[PDB]
Amino acid sequence: MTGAVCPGSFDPVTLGHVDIFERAAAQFDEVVVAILVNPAKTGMFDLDERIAMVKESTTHLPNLRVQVGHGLVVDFVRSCGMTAIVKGLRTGTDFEYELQMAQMNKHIAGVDTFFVATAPRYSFVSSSLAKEVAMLGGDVSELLPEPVNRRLRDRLN
Amino acid sequence: MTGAVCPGSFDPVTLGHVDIFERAAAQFDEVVVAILVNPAKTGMFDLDERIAMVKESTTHLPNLRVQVGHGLVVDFVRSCGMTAIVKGLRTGTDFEYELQMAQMNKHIAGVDTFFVATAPRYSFVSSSLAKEVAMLGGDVSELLPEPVNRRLRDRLN
Amino acid sequence: MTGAVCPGSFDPVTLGHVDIFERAAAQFDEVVVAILVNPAKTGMFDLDERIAMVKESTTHLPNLRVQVGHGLVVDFVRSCGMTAIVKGLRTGTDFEYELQMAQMNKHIAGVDTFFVATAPRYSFVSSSLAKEVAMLGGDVSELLPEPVNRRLRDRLN
Amino acid sequence: MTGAVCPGSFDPVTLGHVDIFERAAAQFDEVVVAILVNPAKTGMFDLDERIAMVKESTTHLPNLRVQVGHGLVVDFVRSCGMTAIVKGLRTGTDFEYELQMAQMNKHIAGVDTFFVATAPRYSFVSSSLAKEVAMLGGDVSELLPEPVNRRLRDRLN
Amino acid sequence: MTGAVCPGSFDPVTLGHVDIFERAAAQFDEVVVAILVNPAKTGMFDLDERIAMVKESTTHLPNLRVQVGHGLVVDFVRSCGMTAIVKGLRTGTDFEYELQMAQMNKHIAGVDTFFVATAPRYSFVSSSLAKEVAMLGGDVSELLPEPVNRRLRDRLN
Amino acid sequence: MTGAVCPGSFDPVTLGHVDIFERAAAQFDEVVVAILVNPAKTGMFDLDERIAMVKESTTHLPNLRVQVGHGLVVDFVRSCGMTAIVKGLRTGTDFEYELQMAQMNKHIAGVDTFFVATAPRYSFVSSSLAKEVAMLGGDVSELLPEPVNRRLRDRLN
Structure with a gap:
């Protein structure tokens, strides 16, 4: 009877995102992770890679499924038969924009949007900063799932 | 299988609070409104009045129940067999403290805490400001449920 | 003796902007809406369209006039014989930048800048989000003046 | 035709407040400084002292007048035949509460409320911090008008 | 040649505070922890208890010393022959007031004030919330030094 | 024994930056200003110009040195034998991002990061706004060091 959507670009998914997936799955009967397409072309990982990374990082969440989102998030949400979005807050979140x-x-x-604070240990990772640091040779492996680290290292080597 | 607690002093409940109750009831199988006791004695309405006002303002929400809270909110939550709190955000919310x-x-x-933005029309009412304005003769009747206005006017007359 | 300038790109004007125009016109003898040019070319509506939309949406404000701004806002302001700017605050405003x-x-x-909170019902519209939602097929007609909706629908059809 | 009210406890008035008075007087035909009564008794300066300090600090503003406020600020404002409040922003302002x-x-x-950023040099003074520092022997004389320093020193000596 | 003061009530000291002490001691030749007196009487631990708890929790920091502060922090700082204050930021910090x-x-x-973000794992503890939770029977032992837990438990038993 | 790095693009250095350099030099034995390279090419002043402007603006700080930074700031910091970064806060700082x-x-x-509030008089200048205003003909000479004004005027004339 209850469901939530977790939308994002997930380029790549971080343990901050996974923390939020876990909390949504614990509180809602079904969770759908909506991976948004990158229309203007310029991400690091292509759509198929992002789907795989999320799937591989969420095998412990049986009531969670992964799908590509197209168009307005609220259109995707309502297409899932749901009326709730669950989004994480972390350090650097543009919360005013999220509220808008x-x-x-x-x-x-x-559609209602529920915000939840990410775990402190994962509160300073973001996809963008994780990529920027790793590209410059910094170790962010504790802040990303192993399926992501595997792929990140490959792009490095 | 799913449940949320909505804790507060509700002295008195506002339409901002009711907005949040409605959204919790729409997204969770069961909702419990936990009315906290005022230990240091100094509220406007006594516990029984606050319970009645919440009950009377929520008859349209069949999956919602009202109970007095004692001790740590998380103790009350877990006593309800739940692991989620749902709290509203409005103008003037001390969000840093709520996050802490x-x-x-x-x-x-x-226990997880989910935050949801209250409807814009009810985003500037708070129990405390509603009481202060009404005590000084201002009309806040559009921002409070009729069961509360009834009681507020009585204290005035 | 008193006057204020309301500067912006107004691409397109929203009811949030009009709310602010109305409050400036109520408090100052004269109001000038300064429509800034888009130098780097990339807006949705060209300058003439933006002027028309603002004019058509403000016929109820006899002490308000519309002009194209060039260069520093403060140069435009002082050219109007004024020393005040009036700007709206809404959800998502970069207030730190506005303060800077x-x-x-x-x-x-x-030149002094006076900030005023936009009406709650219009507090979450912005030109940019209005365009993005409408382009994706969402209904924002309650948040824009009819002269703007007319033009937006034409671009859709 | 135009007017603004500048409400506050002014216990005592600071150069931050005077900065705001000056900007209101420059932009509105008439300005009224509304000194609120301290009902629960506990300020530093009594009402008559606060009025005198504001008057003495504003002799250079011919279109400004000082009056005691009673009840809701908006009642005082409308009693002045006005519909605008002008309030300063400084470091430490509870802006969320001011917005509420x-x-x-x-x-x-x-009634509309216009917010204006106080001059940087006066952006960190507040009545409360000024009193606390001076009581502990710190020099805040550059942040308060001479009529206030005169009175502050007397309470010290 | 270099020194910093870390001022606070430390009622009681938390691991959040100790984190900040450690970072100051790593970056400055000498650090002085200034424990402020509670003039209006109403803390949980008396001055001697607070000193002991800080001392016992900082034996691993040879260049750090503990002293009672009286009067303006800047007077204490300059009395130490220093011109710097080091203060922690955590979730719930009133940063606007700290800036003021x-x-x-x-x-x-x-005197300069340097702000440093406390470690994420200790970013949500504060003296006040730690006491409130513990008084209501919650386990905060991972967020306080063992010398503090020892004393807290004694007050419980 | 003590040292801090002050990283930035300094395109160009402002008196806000110099204020921060001065406070770091007063509190640390050695300060290194790390001028970051502009990889994606698009600044106003080339690297050599930025170095010169910083050097010329800091001749009064004998314990400060200027160097070009490459790669992660923390790599540069540790290469300097240090473990501290000192960064200024001003109006418009994206503090959430700085915290992240x-x-x-x-x-x-x-590596620890210490934040310090820039002097009020220099709290609203930024490199980007200084350039934008000057390019449009506004006078920002009081907010930039004379070595920068000299160069800015040359680009104008």
Whole structure:
């Protein structure tokens, strides 16, 4: 009867994201991770790689599924038969923008957005900073799932 | 299988609170509104009045129940067989403090806290400001449930 | 004797902007809406369209006029014989940047900037989010003036 | 035709407040400084002292007048035949609370609140911190008007 | 040649505070922990207990010393022959107030204040929340030094 | 024994930056200003110009040296034999992002980041806003060192 969508680019998924997936799966009957397409072309990992990384990092969550999102998040959400979005907060989150989008999403489709603080140990990782640090030779392996580290190292070597 | 607690002093409940109750009830199988006791004595409405006002303002929510909370919120939550708290954000929310408590609550009891932005029209009411304005003769009746306005007017007259 | 400038790109004007125009016109003898040019070319509506949309959306404000701005806002302001800017705050406003600019504008030209919170119902619309949602097929017609909706729909059809 | 109210406890007035008075007087035909009563008794300077300090610190502002406020600020404002409040922002301002009050004041009485950033040199003084520092023997004389320093020193000696 | 003061009430000291002590001691030749007196009487631990808890929790920091502070922090700082204060940031810090005080402290005594983010694992503990949780029976032992837990448990038993 | 790095693009250095250099030099035995390379090519001043401007603006700081940074800031810091970064806060600073980077920098290299509020008079200048205003003909000469104004005027004339 209950369901939530966890939308994002996940380029790549981090342990911060996985923390949020785990909490959504614990509180909702079904969770759908919506991987948004990168239309303007310029990400690090292509869509298939991002799906695989999320799937491989979430095998311990039987009530969670992974799907590609297209168009408005609220359209995807309602297409899943749901009316809730679950999003993580971490250090560096643009929360004012997240609030603006949440209020807009409520306005246009009646979809609620629930925010949850990510675990402190994963509160400073973001996809973008993780990539930037790793590209410059820094070790972020404790902040990403092993399926992601495997792929990141390959791009390095 | 799913449940959330909505804790607060509700002295008195506002339409901002009710907005949040409605969204929790739409997303969780069961919702429990936990009315905290005022230990240091100094609220406007006594416990029984606060319970009644919440009950009367939530008759349209069949999966919601009202109970008095004692001790740590996380103790009450876990006593309800749940592991989630749902709290509203509005203008004037001390969000840094709410985040601190959420991280502490997660640490001590494993309880997740989900934050949701209250509807814009109810985003500037708070129990405290509602009381202060009404005591000084201002009309806040559009921001409180009719069961609360009834009681507020009585204290005025 | 009193006057304020309301500067912006207005691509397109929203009811959030109009709310702010109305409050400036109520508090100042004259208001000038300064539509900034888009130098690096990349907006949705060209300058003439933006002027028309603002004019058509403000016919109820007899003491308000619309002009194209060029160069520093403070140069435009002082060219209007004024020393005040009126700007709206809404959800998602980069207020730190607005404050930085206000302090800089005061420093270089002695111009004061007055900030006013937009009405809650219009607090989550922005030109950019309105366009993005509409382009993806979402209904934002309640958050934009009818002169803008008319033009937006035409670009859709 | 235009007017603004500048409300506060002014216990005592600071150069931060005077900065804001000056900007209101430059932009509005008339300005009224509303000194709020201290009902629960516990300020440093009594009402008459606060009025005198504001008057003496504003002799260079011919279109500004000083009055004691009673009850809701919006009641005082409308009693002045005005519909605008002008308030300063400085370091340490509880802006979320100021926003909440502004939205509430708009809701109950249709009164607009304009916020303006205080001059950087006066951005870290507040009545409360000024008193606390001076009581402990610190020199805050550059951040307060001479009429206030005169009175502060007397309480010291 | 270099020195910093770490001021606070430390009622009681937390691992968040100790984290900050460690970083100051690593970056400055000498560190002085200034324990402020509680003038209005109402803390949990008396001055001697607070000193002991800090001393016992910092035996691994040979260049750190503990002293009682009286009066303005900047007076204490300059009495130590120093011109720097080091303060931690954590979740729930009133940073605007900390900034206001820092700018005031710079103004009155030329003392600089350096802010450092506490370690994520200790970012949600504060003296006040630690006491409140423990008094209600919650386990905060991982967030406080063992010398503090020893004393906290005694007050419980 | 003590040292700090002050990293930035300094395109160009402002008096806000110099304020921070001065405070670092007063509190640490050695300070290194790390000028980051602009890899994606698009700054106003080339690397040699930026170095010269910083050097010329810091002749009064004998314990400060200027060097070009390459790669991760923490790699540069540790290459200097240091473990501290000193960064300024001003109006418009993206402090959430600065905090995220600080926590990440601590995680990957054990390097501490100390934040200090810039002097109020220099709190609203940034390299980017200074350039934008000057390019549009505004006078920012009081907010930049004379070595920078000299070069800025040359580009104008």
